[PDB]
């Protein structure tokens, strides 16, 4: 006796995936600094996000099968690639270098880390040849037969990054298209997956910083009220463990040298910038962290890691096990130069189930970076002049446990950043994109007239 009746525009959605687009704020675009994440060609955002808080709704969330982190990882690559096409190939640099050790003012730890390479080079005219010199680190030169050569010249060429652009992460936003919707979990105890009972739809997500790091997530967004531990499965070994702090420990990553960037004409209208000389003395680039707030922060994680394993296990830490230089060490780009910092001083403890001394991390600096492990790409970072020093948070921290012992009294957690999308999944865990299905029928009492 009841009658079918359509209803256009009911709040009914479905789990879907699409191409979310960019958004950025105002003055990060009008300054025109030509950021490598080119938000100057991107949409300017709203004056305020209309964070509508829904009621009485429990949405089934998941942060591990999310599709926004697969779409962010494609857009970061295509921004880091598209912003290198108008830059100069360093294909006349693959020559036979003639290097020697620098001993101007050298401490014994940075003993032979940097070599003074002097090579022939084509000038602006295509028939004369100048004789120049430079300063390359030992992570950029291999030996030929003392005659050296660059580390890349038997595997790819190298766009130099144009020094107009800058790798400093401006916060970008992700907005759903028309017809879609983004759901932000406003819960505080949401671990990884399940009913988040306080949903709130959002047209455009907050400022996501596209920073890249390894073993230590930097300038992240901090989980309030606690320090939380995320994992796709805490008993698996291949799955990482994402820790997220509530108080940020501070890091002071500096470089003491005062190198002089010196331009070199290679062909017509193409320059190549090289470290000419080190003004003053040469020392190793280090990083500081205060132990009083670090050892406290490791004391917070062990108290929270003993919920998943029991309140009596001897939680242990250790330094990285193996790999190449981008996973076995903390890797970041502080102010336009790439530090590979040794974190064997941080992760060394033992907790047996019961102040300005400032732990130092010695770092090495490379220039022939790869950054995505793509066979055929390389990006010689141009040298920045002056001392360089940045001060930054450490909000997140990645761990992988290890092995099997048939004895659950101890677990030795080791850092490791084997993927580059685990950083961004620590910031797009609250979100999920759904498509609106506006049609809907329902029985009521209508009888049509004609």
């Amino acid at each position: 006796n009841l009658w079918v009746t359509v209803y256009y525009g009911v709040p009914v959605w479905k789990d879907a995936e699409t191409t979310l687009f960019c958004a950025s704020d105002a003055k990060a675009y009008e300054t025109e600094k030509h950021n490598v994440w080119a938000t100057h060609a991107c949409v300017p955002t709203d004056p305020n996000p209309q964070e509508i808080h829904l009621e009485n709704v429990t949405e089934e969330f998941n942060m591990w099968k999310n599709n926004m982190v697969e779409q962010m990882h494609t857009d970061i690559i295509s921004l880091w690639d598209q912003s290198l096409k108008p830059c100069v190939k360093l294909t006349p640099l693959c020559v036979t270098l003639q290097c020697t050790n620098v001993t101007n003012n050298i401490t014994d730890d940075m003993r032979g880390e940097l070599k003074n390479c002097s090579f022939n080079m084509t000038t602006e005219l295509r028939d004369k040849k100048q004789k120049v010199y430079s300063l390359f680190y030992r992570l950029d030169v291999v030996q030929i037969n003392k005659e050296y050569r660059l580390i890349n010249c038997n595997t790819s060429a190298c766009t130099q990054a144009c020094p107009k652009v800058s790798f400093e992460p401006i916060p970008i936003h992700y907005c759903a298209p028309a017809g879609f919707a983004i759901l932000k979990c406003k819960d505080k105890k949401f671990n990884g997956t399940g009913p988040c009972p306080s949903v709130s739809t959002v047209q455009c997500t907050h400022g996501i910083k596209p920073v890249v790091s390894t073993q230590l997530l930097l300038n992240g967004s901090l989980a309030e009220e606690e320090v939380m531990i995320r994992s796709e499965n805490i008993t698996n070994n291949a799955k990482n463990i994402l820790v997220q702090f509530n108080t940020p420990v501070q890091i002071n990553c500096t470089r003491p040298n005062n190198n002089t960037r010196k331009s070199i004409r290679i062909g017509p209208g193409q320059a190549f910038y090289a470290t000419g000389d080190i003004i003053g003395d040469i020392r190793q680039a280090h990083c500081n962290v205060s132990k009083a707030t670090w050892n406290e922060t490791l004391g917070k994680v062990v108290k929270q890691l003993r919920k998943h394993f029991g309140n009596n296990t001897i939680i242990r830490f250790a330094n990285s096990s193996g790999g190449d230089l981008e996973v076995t060490t903390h890797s970041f780009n502080c102010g336009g130069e790439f530090f590979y910092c040794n974190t064997s001083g941080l992760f060394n403890s033992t907790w047996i189930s019961n102040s300005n001394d400032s732990i130092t991390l010695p770092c090495r600096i490379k220039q022939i970076i790869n950054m995505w492990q793509r066979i055929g790409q390389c990006m010689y970072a141009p040298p920045i002049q002056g001392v360089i020093r940045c001060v930054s948070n450490i909000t997140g921290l990645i761990l992988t446990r290890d092995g099997g012992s048939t004895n659950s009294t101890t677990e030795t957690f080791r850092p490791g950043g084997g993927d580059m999308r685990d950083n961004w999944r620590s910031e797009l865990y609250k979100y999920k994109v759904v498509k609106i299905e506006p049609l809907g029928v329902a029985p009521t009492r209508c009888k049509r007239r004609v």
Partner: protein, 131 residues
Amino acid sequence: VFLGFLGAAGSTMGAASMTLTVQARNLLSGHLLKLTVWGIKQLQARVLAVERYLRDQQLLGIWGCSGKLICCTNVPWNSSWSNRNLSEIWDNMTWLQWDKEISNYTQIIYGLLEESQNQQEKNEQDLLALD
């Protein structure tokens, strides 16, 4: 009484059926190759948002619901899809719980509406024809 976009998602079906205007109004809105990176992501989103909207408006067009929101039709509610009271359907549930309840009986209904319209327009055109 302005909730916002999707603001009555967990509300009652008898009160989410009074805020259909705002979810209907938010179904379409609005140095060289960096314009093409964000551009083909924006242009593929605007064309898809239009032809998705035109599909649900054309599909609503052939049932006798051309320019309406609360449109009601001729075909009665087959009780095999659900056997519930009108109070247990309208003023206690929500639309998200309702869509999971009859997700199997959508295409059965969406073919029942099109045949009741083509029967209707061929009988309307012969009613005023004798005119």
